[PDB]
Design a protein around this ligand. Structure first.
Ligand SMILES: NC(=O)CC[C@H](N)C(=O)NS(=O)(=O)OC[C@H]1O[C@@H](n2cnc3c(N)ncnc32)[C@H](O)[C@@H]1O
Length: 529
RNA sequence: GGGGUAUCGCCAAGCGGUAAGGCACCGGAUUCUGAUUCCGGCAAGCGAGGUUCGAAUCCUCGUACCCCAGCCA
């Protein structure tokens, strides 16, 4: 429950509404991100929980900012998250003729006029946060003139910026949005849905309430920046001949630490090429989170966990991570991979290897077991061998043994180095029937793999607030390693994620991995303390 | 000027009745993943008054922060 669901209850009880009808209206000017997922779970979850409906509407009022690429993706991510919208997908542009007819009703009613103040002029006349605005000299034209002037605008008779339709409200309002807001402006730009049938486009404030009203939205849910705009939303509906009046409720938008959640900044990372694309695994987009290895289910739990309030907030990465870990910890099958490999030779082992039975999920036998090859020339992670160590360092020491994962207890008794004194091979001896701990990979049956270790995109908790957010990008957000995975991973499918024991949850990077060079994405590492 | 928000490190309940839950964090028990699971601990309600038997929940005075001067959304 949240303040909005409590409002909905009250409405239902009082009898103000018998059903609920919400909507998610993203402008198609970028890809969806985790914040949108908060708005999606909210609007679609509420709908289904109350057995109501929720529309997907593309608020496409600004042609020069949108693209058909984005609409195809948005539907995609909405469905991927697990939600279904009511009826066909809606577009604000589906109401372009209705909006126009309404502008004419306002004009006829005397509440709108065609203003000819330049774009700089309008701002000069607008007033300030503490100084009232002033009426334009064109404010008092006749209904007849406004009707003709507006049509002139519609027919392409005016150059861009040369005219616009404004609402005749109150230029001294303490609410800046009520100081004769613009309803329509001239843009000779082709629209992704209506082509070039229109040269004048409606503004958000005029478009949003009418679309909602027409669709029968019972609760228009949006973020806090639109708190001031509500006054205009109610004005527009109070002043046109329309049968319903959806009510608006605002909540705080999600902010996630170490990341930027704004289409404009996410666009820049994409445009300047500082990430592979909108779907780069380090991106906070739904597609990036997906490519990274997140489950639509873990994102929904995330939204369920963070809540819906009016308090501004900034969630920590730890919280999101807890969600995906909680999912993959139970569902992911274990496997063996080595990110940094140092050769280890068990001179005590004779033969060309053998096979060892390995569990697919330690704490869950039902997931089955697999047969993995063992031998005397394996691979281990460098961090596992230390010539020296305290009572706590549990791995391999140059005068001690350790349990090779799902296999034998071995004991390092020598080592060998190269020029820089870097070790190249560790010589050990194994025990007969020996079946800390360490994962491994037999060098003979080792699938060469490209591992991708991701990290926070930015090096500061609040990159948005930085002077130039791009200069604070983390140079280690991605660190590509060549390692070795046990041969079973040979059949990894870009879709499932396995747990690389003692390392993290990886998923076949569904973007670069060829049949020859598999590329794996590290979704999230394990909790390490 | 106006609109909003002020609870534990981060979120977030409680809506006059005597402070939930999650994440983080500090311990302990398990464990062939220093993981998991597992129990145990953890603070708190902007200041100042004011009504009340009693408020985090009501009221006033402040204070702090956030949003609004796109022919963006
Ligand atoms: N009255 C409204 O809802 C305004 C819709 C407007 N077209 C819009 O803001 N376009 S948008 O594409 O930028 O966003 C669409 C909706 O996504 C949600 N949203 C966007 N960013 C969000 C964030 N960081 N946290 C939570 N919710 C967020 C809002 O409901 C937004 O309206």
């Amino acid at each position: 429950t949240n303040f909005i669901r409590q409002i909905i209850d009250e409405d239902l009880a009082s009898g103000k509404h018998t059903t609920v009808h919400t909507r998610f209206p993203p402008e198609p000017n970028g890809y969806l991100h985790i914040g949108h997922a908060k708005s999606i779970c909210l609007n679609f979850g509420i709908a289904q929980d109350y057995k109501g409906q929720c529309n997907l509407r593309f608020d496409d009022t600004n042609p020069v900012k949108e693209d058909i690429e984005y609409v195809e993706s948005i539907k995609n991510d909405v469905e991927w998250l697990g939600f279904h919208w009511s009826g066909n997908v809606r577009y604000s542009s589906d109401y372009f003729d209705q909006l126009h007819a309404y502008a004419i009703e306002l004009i006829n009613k005397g509440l709108a006029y065609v203003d000819e103040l330049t774009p700089e002029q309008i701002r000069e006349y607008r007033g300030t946060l503490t100084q009232p605005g002033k009426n334009s000299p064109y404010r008092d034209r006749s209904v007849e003139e406004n009707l003709a002037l507006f049509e002139k605008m519609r027919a392409g008779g005016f150059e861009e910026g040369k005219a616009c339709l404004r609402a005749k409200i109150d230029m001294a309002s303490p609410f800046i949005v009520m100081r004769d807001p613009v309803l329509y402006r001239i843009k000779f730009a082709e629209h992704h849905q209506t082509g070039n049938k229109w040269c004048i486009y409606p503004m958000y404030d005029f478009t949003h309430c009418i679309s909602d009203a027409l669709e029968g939205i019972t609760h228009s849910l949006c973020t806090l920046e639109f708190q001031d705009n509500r006054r205009l939303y109610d004005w527009v509906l109070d002043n046109i001949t329309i049968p319903v009046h959806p009510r608006q409720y605002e909540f705080s938008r999600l902010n996630l630490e170490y990341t930027v959640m704004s289409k404009r900044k996410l666009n820049l990372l994409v445009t300047d090429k500082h990430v592979e694309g909108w779907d780069d695994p380090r991106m906070p987009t739904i597609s990036g989170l997906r490519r990274r290895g997140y489950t639509a289910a873990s994102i929904r739990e995330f939204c369920k966990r963070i809540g819906v309030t009016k308090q501004d907030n900034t969630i920590e990465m730890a919280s999101l991570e807890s969600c995906i870990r909680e999912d993959l910890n139970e569902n992911a099958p274990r496997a063996m991979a080595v990110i940094d490999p140092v050769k280890l030779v068990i001179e005590n082992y004779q033969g060309e290897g053998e096979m060892v039975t390995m569990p697919n999920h330690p704490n869950k036998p039902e997931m089955g077991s697999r047969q993995v090859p063992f031998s005397g020339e394996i691979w281990i992670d460098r961090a596992d061998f230390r010539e020296e160590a305290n009572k706590q360092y549990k791995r391999l020491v140059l005068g001690k043994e350790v349990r090779l994962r799902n296999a034998y207890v071995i004991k390092a008794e020598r080592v060998e180095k190269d020029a820089e004194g870097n070790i190249t091979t560790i010589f050990c001896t194994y025990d007969a029937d020996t079946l800390g701990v360490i994962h491994w990979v037999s060098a003979a049956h080792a699938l060469p793999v490209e591992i991708r270790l991701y990290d926070r995109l930015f090096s500061v908790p609040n990159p948005g607030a930085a002077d130039d957010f791009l200069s604070v990008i983390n140079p280690e957000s991605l660190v590509i390693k060549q390692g070795f995975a046990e041969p079973s991973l040979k059949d990894a499918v870009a879709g499932k994620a396995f747990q690389f024991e003692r390392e993290g949850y990886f998923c076949l990077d569904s973007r670069h991995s060829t049949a020859e060079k598999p590329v794996f994405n590290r979704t999230v590492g394990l909790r390490d303390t």
